[PDB]
Design a protein around this ligand. Structure first.
Ligand SMILES: Cc1cncc2cccc(S(=O)(=O)N3CCCNC[C@@H]3C)c12
Ligand SMILES: Cc1cncc2cccc(S(=O)(=O)N3CCCNC[C@@H]3C)c12
Length: 269
């Protein structure tokens, strides 16, 4: 099911953050002493309750090593109890320029994320995250021999059944073109595939996607949609990686590949 643990089973330790519908806490699980993260819930915008519920539904149906696991629920207030991932997030790690990630570790990271997404796309119906970017990838370990190096986190914006329209304004540098300016079949799983190409770009270069450019917001969106504007892949990138990224970021969603092709090409690098 989704199990309920309320208060006796859990012990709090600190506070590790704020951000979305409440307060996040570090804590631990008293029965076997696993360490966990605890997400709490704090009119018309008081329907972020709907957000909390949606995150629950999606998580309860996922069970994979490269996806953050939901342990249980707690009541009064409403809380989510999830595994705690020790080494921070990908976006912050890439910001340390003095200590670049080594090439073999970079490959693990790329593959580990691709496995997580492949699993999501194989569900019926397919699960779409909708907010994939570097701050949403959490790091379990940076040892090249660890069983797991990276995990997909924060299903704050996602859905089932391949449909949804344009919604809420976004950091457009990570999103597929059919999702930004409005469209109709927009938000299939193919949109996540475009976001994955940006994650590959960032891991490869250590840089933000589209940071080479400066445009006003309307102009930038039009360049990406109509002119095919993309980040520049460096000359020394291996050709096999260059191909995977270019296919993944195609303007036509139908040309973005299946994750079975993607995992195979990455394993050959
Ligand atoms: C959304 C949801 C979706 N799927 C399974 C669930 C199992 C238990 C509780 C919920 S839940 O509604 O999200 N939820 C928050 C409070 C509402 N009722 C009980 C529980 C505390 C589920
Ligand atoms: C789930 C989780 C799991 N493990 C470690 C964590 C460390 C910091 C923040 C979180 S976290 O709360 O999930 N989280 C995501 C929501 C945005 N604000 C808080 C931070 C980004 C962790």
């Amino acid at each position: 099911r989704l199990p309920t643990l309320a208060d006796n089973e859990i012990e709090y330790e600190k506070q590790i953050g704020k951000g979305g519908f409440g307060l996040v806490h570090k804590g631990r699980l008293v029965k076997d002493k696993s360490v966990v993260a605890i997400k709490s819930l704090i009119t018309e915008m008081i329907e972020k309750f709907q957000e909390f519920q949606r995150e629950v539904f999606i998580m309860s149906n996922l069970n994979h090593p490269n996806i953050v696991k939901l342990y249980g629920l707690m009541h009064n207030p409403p809380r989510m109890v999830m595994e705690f991932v020790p080494c921070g997030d990908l976006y912050h790690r890439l910001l340390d320029k003095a200590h670049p990630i080594k090439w073999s570790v970079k490959l693990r990271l790329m593959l580990d994320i691709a496995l997580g997404i492949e699993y999501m796309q194989n569900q019926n119906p397919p699960i779409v995250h909708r907010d994939l970017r570097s701050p949403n990838i959490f790091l379990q370990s940076l040892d090249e021999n660890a069983p797991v190096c990276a995990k997909v986190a924060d299903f704050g914006l996602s859905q089932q059944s391949v449909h949804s329209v344009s919604g809420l304004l976004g950091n457009f540098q990570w999103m597929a073109p059919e999702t930004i300016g409005a469209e109709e079949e927009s938000y299939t799983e193919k949109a996540d595939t475009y976001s994955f190409a940006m994650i590959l770009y960032t891991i490869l270069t250590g840089e933000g996607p589209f940071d080479e450019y400066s445009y006003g917001k309307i102009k930038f969106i039009n360049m990406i949609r109509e002119e095919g504007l993309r980040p520049t892949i460096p000359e020394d990138c291996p050709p096999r990686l260059r191909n995977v990224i270019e296919l993944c970021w195609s303007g036509d969603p139908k040309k973005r590949p299946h994750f079975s092709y993607i995992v195979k090409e990455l394993s050959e690098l």
